């Protein structure tokens, strides 16, 4: 299933950046700061893809809409948790 695959890719991408923030508390590498901002943007747009997939799939008599939109909610919460860590972290020095 391609949707479940993206859902998994995204959680793991999010986690990867989360782990990085935990190991490099210091808001430094302008490179990785850009790279992190690039990936997070990519994720915002990936979540629009997932949401879109659900909307056009609502007629499909198998598909588990409510079970899928619940997984997208969760991913939005995860992204939003991390955008906060990132923003908080930037206000810590240099």
């Amino acid at each position: 299933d391609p949707f479940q695959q993206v859902v998994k890719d995204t959680k793991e991408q999010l986690n990867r950046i989360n782990n990085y923030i935990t190991r490099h508390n210091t808001a430094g590498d302008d490179d990785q700061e850009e790279e992190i901002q690039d990936i997070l943007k990519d994720v915002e747009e990936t979540i629009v893809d997932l949401d879109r997939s659900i909307i056009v799939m609502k007629r499909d008599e198998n598909e588990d809409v409510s079970g899928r939109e619940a997984q997208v909610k969760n991913i939005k919460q995860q992204l939003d948790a991390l955008k906060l860590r990132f923003d908080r972290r930037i206000q810590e020095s240099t």
Partner: peptide, 23 residues
Amino acid sequence: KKSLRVSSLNKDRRLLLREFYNL
């Protein structure tokens, strides 16, 4: 050197996107 991007993620995104019209 340090590497954050997940492998296969662009490719999986393209599969999901290609399914979008499939009806």
